[PDB]
Amino acid sequence: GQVKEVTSLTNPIVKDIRALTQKKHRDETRSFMAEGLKLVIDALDLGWKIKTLVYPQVEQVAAKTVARGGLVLEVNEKVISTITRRDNPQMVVGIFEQRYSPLRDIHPQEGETYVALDRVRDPGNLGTIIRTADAAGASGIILVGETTDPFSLETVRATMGSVFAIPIARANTEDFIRWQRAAGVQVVATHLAGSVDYRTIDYKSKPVVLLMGNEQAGLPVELAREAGALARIPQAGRADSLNLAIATGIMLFEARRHLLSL
Amino acid sequence: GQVKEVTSLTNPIVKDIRALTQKKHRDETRSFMAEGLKLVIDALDLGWKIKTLVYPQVEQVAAKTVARGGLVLEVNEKVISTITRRDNPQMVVGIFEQRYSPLRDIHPQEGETYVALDRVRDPGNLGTIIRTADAAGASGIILVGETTDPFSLETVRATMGSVFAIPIARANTEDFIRWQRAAGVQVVATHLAGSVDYRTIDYKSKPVVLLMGNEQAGLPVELAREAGALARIPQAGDSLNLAIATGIMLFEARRHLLS
Ligand SMILES: [Co+2]
Ligand SMILES: [Co+2]
């Protein structure tokens, strides 16, 4: 690794970072950006691999970076707010390697809760669910099919750091169904048609996978057939008009209700 | 003539619609924008005053609009995109009168829950909370102190139309405390110091007001002190998004009344 200074937007290295706004670029580098000195520090203690740092504590992190084998760019106020796209930005920004837990290395144990999200499309929702799942003590997030990107700048930010702290797995629909069948789990799916009251469900017998549907479409029948129980949250009309993050939060706090205490 | 065609983005009438991005014009006209044919329809059925309709059922809405006093504007898809500021926008847009309920006219009763937000600042939080309180059967939202505007475009959007369905009141801290003290309510405030587990509080004896602190400062002493109970949500290792936390509160306060 090495240190190097930059003040030009046209600089080769800066073009590469800004290109992480785009999904296709991030996928090819398997990389992503996270803003915040503190967050950068916490990420390192949790075993995240850092590729580039950008900006007194500042100086020992720069040290740790070069030591494991990656770059360090000192920069002007105009560059940092270009790459992070904020008029008034943070002084520090790390570029890390993405990580996904492979689905077949997940073996749910007693007391555990996972949240599986079928074709989640809103980065706000995805990031808020990740944070909430971490607050609630879930052991993992499983992204099923084509979802919005958990490592995009907008999702990461809405995690407030929880992206570093709870594992995330991705799978197509077939592999997910196979994994769930063989995992010995109670799959609780929110799905209006065929439902029981979320509060009457057995969350204690087996590890729980909470299966949530896509914001607009909801779960398809093939996922919904895979469920041990179909959940609804009773509302003041016969409508289900809950934001996906909110419903997901409600479900996490009920499923772990018997496990969370003051 | 109440129906009228416009081409030019320069056309005065289109500049005034775009002025509803500024808070000051919104406040002095008392008006605001809501996008979507189904939303405009539901607003008209819920009895909101439409000032302006911009664009089959469209024909039906257009006639409710002339019959209730409003103006109709037929326009190019360029025009519609420029007032919104959204790629691929809805094809119908309504401009409505703002409606606040005065606080003094709310007399809470047994089985009712209200949400009070202390200087909420994020438009997406405010909007999802309005929508969630609507879904849970809450009877009112109470904006306490300086808050983000519930009738901004960003808040209205995040409500999914719920801005039309649940009353909104606004009050300075002092009128809230005055109201609350005379209203016969159990105020349950999310606040860490002095708090109990949200699940052990008494949500049955009195109509409940859930009081949710500002996202970073939390509740000022004046409000926390008045609360009948201080609540908290047990977490693994205190940092829920305001709106998630409010949803969880609402669905516990109303746990005994929803089935
Ligand atoms: Co590339
Ligand atoms: Co004006």
Beta bridge partners of residue A52, listed in sequence order: A71, A95
Give the gap in angstroms from C-alpha A140 to the nearest C-alpha of chain B: 14
**Method for structure elucidation:** X-ray
Closest CA to B235 of A245, A259, A178: A259
Residue A241 in tokens: 């008009």
Q: Which chain A residues are Cβ-neighbours of B111 within 8 angstroms?
A: none
CA–CA separation, B72 and B5 (whole Å): 9
Nearest to B168 by CA among B100, B223, B66: B100
Alpha-carbon distance of B46 to B65, in angstroms, equals 14
Option in A128, A245, A260 nearest B235 (CB): A260
- Please compute Rg for chain A using Cα positions: 20
- Ligand-binding site membership of B186 (annotated): no
Which residues in chain B have Cβ-Cβ distances shorter than 8 Å to A249?
240, 244, 247-248
A262 interaction partners in chain B (CB closer than 8 Å) = 196-197, 232, 234
Q: From CA A162, how far away is CA A133, in angstroms rounded? A: 9
Length of chain B: 259
On whether A47 is known to bind a ligand per the annotation, the reply is no
DSSP states along chain A: --EEEE--TTSHHHHHHHGGGSHHHHHHHTEEEEE-HHHHHHHHHTT--EEEEE--HHHHHHHHHHHHT-EEEEE-HHHHHHHT--SS--S-EEEEE-----GGG----TT-EEEEEES---HHHHHHHHHHHHHHT--EEEEESS---TTSHHHHHHHTTGGGTS-EEEE-HHHHHHHHHHTT-EEEEE-STT-EEGGGS--SSS-EEEEE--TTT---HHHHTT-SEEEE---SSS-----HHHHHHHHHHHHTGGG---
CA–CA separation, B162 and A209 (whole Å): 31
Categorise residue A66: left if φ over 0, alpha if ψ from -120 to 50, beta otherwise.
alpha
A-chain CB neighbours of B131 within 8 Å are: 241, 243
CB B140 within 8 A of CB B169: yes
**CB pair distance less than 8 Å for B132 and A236:** no
Nearest neighbour of B244 by CB, restricted to A128, A236, A260: A128
Please tell me the distance from the alpha carbon of residue A38 to that of residue A35, in angstroms, as a whole number. Answer: 9
Interface test with B, best of A199, A253, A259 (most B CBs within 10 A): A253
Which ligand sits nearest to residue A20's alpha carbon? 1
Tell me which residue of A3, A149, A136 sits closest to A65, measured CA to CA. Answer: A3
User: CB pairs below 8 Å between A and B: how many?
Assistant: 74
Task: Please list every residue in chain A whose beta carbon sits closer than 8 Å to the beta carbon of residue B135.
Answer: 235-236, 239, 241-242
- Token look-up 């709310």 returns B106
The candidate with the shortest Cα–Cα distance to B247, out of A121, A254, A122, is A254
CB neighbourhood size of A159 (10 A): 23
Ordered DSSP codes for chain B: --EEEE--TTSHHHHHHHGGGSHHHHHHHTEEEEE-HHHHHHHHHHTPPEEEEE--HHHHHHHHHHHHT-EEEEE-HHHHHHHHT-SS--S-EEEEE-----GGG----TT-EEEEEES---HHHHHHHHHHHHHHT--EEEEESS---TTSHHHHHHHTTGGGTS-EEEE-HHHHHHHHHHTT-EEEEE-STT-EEGGGS--SSS-EEEEE--TTT---HHHHHH-SEEEE---------HHHHHHHHHHHHTGGG--
- Cα A195 to its chain centre, rounded Å, is 28
CB contact under 8 A, B236 and A136: yes
* B256 phi, psi to nearest 5 deg: -65, -10
How many Å apart are CA A44 and CA A92, to the nearest integer?
14
Q: Using an 8 Å Cβ cutoff, are A190 and A229 in contact? A: no
Report the alpha-carbon distance of residue A70 to residue B39 in Å, rounded.
52
Q: How far apart are CA B129 and CA B134, in angstroms?
A: 8
- For residue A139, give both structure tokens: 């052991």
Strands A113-118 and B168-171: unpaired
Homologous superfamily in CATH for domain A107-262: SPOUT methyltransferase, trefoil knot domain (3.40.1280.10)
When the candidates are 3.40.640.10, 3.40.50.2300, 3.40.1280.10, 2.40.128.720, the CATH number that belongs to B107-259 is 3.40.1280.10
Among all ligands shown, which has an atom nearest to the Cα of A17? 1
> Pairing relation of β-strands B93-97 and B31-35?
antiparallel
Strand partners, B72: B3, B53
Q: How far apart are CA B134 and CA B151, in angstroms?
A: 16
Q: Residue A190 is which amino acid?
A: T
B151 token code pair: 């009738």
Write out the residues of chain B at the interface with chain A, using a CB-CB cutoff of 8 A: 124, 128, 131-132, 134-137, 160, 162, 196-197, 199, 232-236, 239-241, 243-244, 247-248, 251, 255, 258-259
Nearest-CB residue to B136 (from A124, A199, A235): A235
Any idea which ligand is nearest the CA of A23?
1
Domain coordinates of chain B in residue numbers? 1-100, 107-259
